Amino acid sequence: TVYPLHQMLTDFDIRNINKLSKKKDIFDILSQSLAPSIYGHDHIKKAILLMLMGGVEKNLENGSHLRGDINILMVGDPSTAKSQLLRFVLNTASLAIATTGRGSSGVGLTAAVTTGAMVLADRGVVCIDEFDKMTDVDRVAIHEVMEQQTVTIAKAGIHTTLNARCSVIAAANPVFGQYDVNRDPHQNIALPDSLLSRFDLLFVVTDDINEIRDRSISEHVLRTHRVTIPFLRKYVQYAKERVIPQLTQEAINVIVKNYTDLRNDDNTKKSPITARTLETLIRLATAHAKVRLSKTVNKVDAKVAANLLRFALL
Amino acid sequence: ALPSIQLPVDYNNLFNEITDFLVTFKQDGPKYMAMLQKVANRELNSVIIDLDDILQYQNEKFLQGTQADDLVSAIQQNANHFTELFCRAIDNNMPLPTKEIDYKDDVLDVILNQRRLRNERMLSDRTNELFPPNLTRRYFLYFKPLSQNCARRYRKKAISSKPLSVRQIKGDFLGQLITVRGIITRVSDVKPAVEVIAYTCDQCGYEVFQEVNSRTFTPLSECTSEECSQNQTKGQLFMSTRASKFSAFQECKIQELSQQVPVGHIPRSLNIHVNGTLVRSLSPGDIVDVTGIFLPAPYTGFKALKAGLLTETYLEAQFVRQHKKKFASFSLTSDVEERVMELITSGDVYNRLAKSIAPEIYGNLDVKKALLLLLVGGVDKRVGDGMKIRGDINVCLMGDPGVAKSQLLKAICKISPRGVYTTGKGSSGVGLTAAVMGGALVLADNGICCIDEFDKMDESDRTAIHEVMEQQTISISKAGINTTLNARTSILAAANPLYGRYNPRLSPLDNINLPAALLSRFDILFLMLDIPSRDDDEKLAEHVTYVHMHNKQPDLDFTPVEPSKMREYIAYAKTKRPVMSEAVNDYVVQAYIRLRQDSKREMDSKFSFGQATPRTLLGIIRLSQALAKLRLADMVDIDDVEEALRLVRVSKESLYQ
Numbered sequence: 029t030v031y032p033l034h035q036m037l038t039d040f041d042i043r044n045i046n047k048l049s050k051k052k053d054i055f056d057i058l059s060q061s062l063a064p065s066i067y068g069h070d071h072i073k074k075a076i077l078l079m080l081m082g083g084v085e086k087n088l089e090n091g092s093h094l095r096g097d098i099n100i101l102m103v104g105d106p107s108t109a110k111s112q113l114l115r116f117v118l119n120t121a122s123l124a125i126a127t128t129g130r131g132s133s134g135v136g137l138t139a140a141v142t143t144g145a146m147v148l149a150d151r152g153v154v155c156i157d158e159f160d161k162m163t164d165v166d167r168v169a170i171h172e173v174m175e176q177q178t179v180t181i182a183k184a185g186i187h188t189t190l191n192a193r194c195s196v197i198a199a200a201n202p203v204f205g206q207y208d209v210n211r212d213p214h215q216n217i218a219l220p221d222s223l224l225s226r227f228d229l230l231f232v233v234t235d236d237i238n239e240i241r242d243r244s245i246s247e248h249v250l251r252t253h254r255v256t257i258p259f260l261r262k263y264v265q266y267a268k269e270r271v272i273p274q275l276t277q278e279a280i281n282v283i284v285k286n287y288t289d290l291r292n293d294d295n296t297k298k299s300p301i302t303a304r305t306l307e308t309l310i311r312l313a314t315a316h317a318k319v320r321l322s323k324t325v326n327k328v329d330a331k332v333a334a335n336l337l338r339f340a341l342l
Numbered sequence: 343a344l345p346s347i348q349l350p351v352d353y354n355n356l357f358n359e360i361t362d363f364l365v366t367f368k369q370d371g372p373k374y375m376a377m378l379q380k381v382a383n384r385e386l387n388s389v390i391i392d393l394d395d396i397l398q399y400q401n402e403k404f405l406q407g408t409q410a411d412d413l414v415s416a417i418q419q420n421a422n423h424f425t426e427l428f429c430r431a432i433d434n435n436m437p438l439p440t441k442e443i444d445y446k447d448d449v450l451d452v453i454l455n456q457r458r459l460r461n462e463r464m465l466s467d468r469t470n471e472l473f474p475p476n477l478t479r480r481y482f483l484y485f486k487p488l489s490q491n492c493a494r495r496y497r498k499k500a501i502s503s504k505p506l507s508v509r510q511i512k513g514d515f516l517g518q519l520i521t522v523r524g525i526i527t528r529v530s531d532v533k534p535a536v537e538v539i540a541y542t543c544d545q546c547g548y549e550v551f552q553e554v555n556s557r558t559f560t561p562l563s564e565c566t567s568e569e570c571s572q573n574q575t576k577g578q579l580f581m582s583t584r585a586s587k588f589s590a591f592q593e594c595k596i597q598e599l600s601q602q603v604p605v606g607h608i609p610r611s612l613n614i615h616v617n618g619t620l621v622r623s624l625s626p627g628d629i630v631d632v633t634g635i636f637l638p639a640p641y642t643g644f645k646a647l648k649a650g651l652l653t654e655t656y657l658e659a660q661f662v663r664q665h666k667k668k669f670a671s672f673s674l675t676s677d678v679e680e681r682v683m684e685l686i687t688s689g690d691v692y693n694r695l696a697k698s699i700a701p702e703i704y705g706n707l708d709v710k711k712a713l714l715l716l717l718v719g720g721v722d723k724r725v726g727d728g729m730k731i732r733g734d735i736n737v738c739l740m741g742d743p744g745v746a747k748s749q750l751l752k753a754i755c756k757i758s759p760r761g762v763y764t765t766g767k768g769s770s771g772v773g774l775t776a777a778v779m780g781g782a783l784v785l786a787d788n789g790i791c792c793i794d795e796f797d798k799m800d801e802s803d804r805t806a807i808h809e810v811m812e813q814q815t816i817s818i819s820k821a822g823i824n825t826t827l828n829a830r831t832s833i834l835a836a837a838n839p840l841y842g843r844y845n846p847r848l849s850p851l852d853n854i855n856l857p858a859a860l861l862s863r864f865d866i867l868f869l870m871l872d873i874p875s876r877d878d879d880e881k882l883a884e885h886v887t888y889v890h891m892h893n894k895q896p897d898l899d900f901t902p903v904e905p906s907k908m909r910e911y912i913a914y915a916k917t918k919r920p921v922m923s924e925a926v927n928d929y930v931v932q933a934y935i936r937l938r939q940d941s942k943r944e945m946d947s948k949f950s951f952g953q954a955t956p957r958t959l960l961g962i963i964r965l966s967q968a969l970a971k972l973r974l975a976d977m978v979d980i981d982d983v984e985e986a987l988r989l990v991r992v993s994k995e996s997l998y999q
């Protein structure tokens with residue numbers, strides 16, 4: 029036989045979703061459902077959902093396709109759960125492969141075996157731990173993987189362009205010690221440059237300490253040692269293949285206003301900002317549309333994308 | 343003792359149906375008369391039997407009666423048996439003379455000719471059981487898969503011809519034609535196989551033909567001939583190599599494409615045997631749909647270990663279709679010019695195509711305007727002695743972080759054939775140079791090569807590329823390589839200015855990290871800098887919102903030129919080789935003095951780059967001569983050259999904004 033040990037939605041489940049889709053506040057509850065063991069970080073959890081959904085995919089006629097999925101980075105002092113969060117990403121993720129630092133060889137590559145992950149992880153969530161530690165040699169390839177969305181192997185050899193369209197998370201320690209919090213908007217990241225852009229969202233988290241927040245940590249930690257989570261992935265698959273929200277003229281002016289704001293004001297405030305940011309705006313909008321199950325994109329969604337990209341920046 | 347159980351399928355009348363399939367035909371005189379006679383005429387060996395037409399025939403034999411037993415399912419159901427059955431029928435209908443066959447002419451045909459002559463003579467004298475039909479062939483029967491555009495008849499489930507995963511392969515596909523796909527591995531070098539090998543006797547002669555069956559055979563001596571036999575006593579006999587019929591044999595293993603591999607396991611190779619004409623068709627590293635009968639070849643022993651019998655199999659090659667087969671080579675320019683003309687007649691081809699390169703992004707009509715030229719290139723030159731002068735265009739795209747510079751490069755390397763996309767860390771120095779056991783530059787040459795992250799490429803790489811603008815060269819002196827290989831490559835390089843982005847308080851060449859030795863080579867450097875503008879960025883946002891929202895970008899009104907027909911036009915463009923008139927030449931000169939003088943009167947620092955070295959002149963002659971070719975020219979008119987100057991000045995000078 030071979031029963032393995034450690035999806036089917038039946039009649040009833042899909043109905044539960046359908047009922048639950050109409051409720052206006054669901055997004056926040058969902059976003060809270062990820063973290064039984066983790067405080068706050070509602071914004072980040074929101075993010076991980078918005079990666080699980082991911083802006084459909086759009087392949088133009090006789091032209092290149094615009095990247096659908098959203099990529100995320102987390103930077104902060106240790107104990108931030110950054111390595112703890114990712115495993116829970118992994119479990120409910122429906123795929124994909126995890127990779128930690130070095131790591132490699134080839135990472136996503138076929139290696140052209142005589143005589144990898146990112147390919148095998150296609151349509152899925154790749155995790156990267158200690159994302160900074162990874163040799164630049166690889167990073168050079170990750171540029172090709174992330175935005176371009178394809179992998180190219182000329183090695184000896186079999187010469188082919190094969191597709192890895194994977195979504196990506198990465199957690200990476202601050203440069204030196206705990207200095208992340210106070211340190212400048214740059215020189216803090218340690219891994220310039222285009223990479224910083226490729227990632228749709230750069231989230232920063234601080235371990236800086238306070239007594240009140242401390243107490244509020246204490247109790248939950250205590251109780252820990254003494255609506256269903258599984259329903260979360262079932263909620264997710266139907267949402268994924270059904271149905272793609274397209275795009276609507278309700279929203280566009282919002283994200284345009286927002287975007288232009290970002291460039292003009294933030295280029296005085298902070299960096300980096302490019303057309304890439306705009307792309308990301310659209311992906312987030314569409315993703316939150318998927319959460320809403322709406323056959324259409326909306327203005328509210330646009331405002332949400334606005335919000336999370338703000339907490340990304342500020 | 344070995345029971346027997348009837349099956350509805352019968353080969354007897356199916357052979358009859360094959361005979362009715364051959365030489366009696368309409369839809370395409372018939373194709374099987376001419377295709378067969380051209381083989382009989384001995385200019386042709388491979389007989390490519392399409393299963394598509396077998397599909398077409400049944401319609402005429404069914405509906406449209408009178409109804410008959412099916413082949414297309416019955417073939418691929420077995421597909422080994424038909425090679426010995428469907429193909430022998432060709433012997434019965436084949437034209438006898440056929441025309442002008444003679445004897446020698448051909449080597450080894452004279453051997454058998456004299457065999458049948460001496461045999462006929464000696465037999466006709468003795469009377470005063472024949473040479474096997476497989477020895478006399480000199481042609482190979484190959485079936486091909488039905489994908490198919492006409493498979494939609496529909497016979498539905500009839501198709502394999504299902505371009506399946508190596509993982510998808512099962513022990514239930516043995517003895518049934520199956521297409522597979524993957525990268526060629528190890529591609530063993532061709533060696534002769536054997537079929538009959540009729541050994542020669544000594545005393546009384548004759549001949550005997552030993553069948554080559556499965557992998558191997560046991561050689562025999564004794565005597566088969568009745569004359570040498572028993573009196574006196576047993577005649578000695580040796581194999582004659584001239585008499586034997588040799589069929590090329592090449593084996594190669596194919597690993598899976600690795601995208602077809604799950605989250606787990608390992609790439610699994612599949613062993614593939616090749617015969618006859620299809621030999622050498624396969625080359626290492628090449629994704630190919632290989633179709634063939636899927637068969638075991640047991641066991642050679644061992645035979646103790648398995649037990650059993652544990653076949654282990656292989657795939658017989660039948661047909662070969664490789665992914666990614668090309669200008670400048672075409673003869674005609676017959677009714678295809680028609681396919682060019684829809685593009686020509688509207689006029690203003692240059693702007694139209696320009697816009698039609700990478701419409702997926704908004705803005706930068708100038709950049710694309712030039713990329714069209716890059717794709718076109720020409721005309722080089724030969725000084726008759728001779729040495730060459732390229733010959734092509736070299737483009738850079740500067741600026742950061744956004745503006746989507748690299749998407750233009752995925753664009754181009756998608757459109758242009760023989761284009762190859764690489765990155766620095768990325769493509770190793772050994773990636774561009776050729777090892778002895780090439781890539782990048784050698785791999786893509788006669789066509790555009792594309793580079794990203796052009797700063798991070800370090801040093802040894804930059805020397806290669808620094809040299810390749812002498813074109814026609816790389817020189818590898820290391821170890822087991824003294825060769826100088828020829829790279830005719832074009833180069834497009836996307837790079838980011840020194841961190842973070844283009845500091846205006848710094849002079850040009852300060853915020854461009856690149857040496858001036860290299861930039862003099864680049865004829866056109868497009869620096870794309872981003873200064874926020876409330877009006878335009880609205881338009882942009884409208885564009886990038888419109889698509890996503892729609893897939894098709896242009897509306898009201900433009901017609902985006904499909905890359906296929908576009909490639910056709912550019913192909914028809916590269917053929918011209920125009921020549922300059924006296925007036926545009928002088929104009930180029932005068933304008934060049936004015937450009938030199940105006941560039942230097944500007945003074946050192948900021949502004950620049952100087953010095954407008956002669957490679958910019960030659961560059962603008964070469965751009966000129968390119969723009970001419972989209973007029974199809976030979977005239978090379980003044981507006982052409984002027985336009986080249988325009989593109990040049992517009993390239994830079996965007997740093998004043």
Ligand SMILES: [Zn+2]
Binds near residue numbers: 543544548569570
């Ligand atoms: Zn004899």
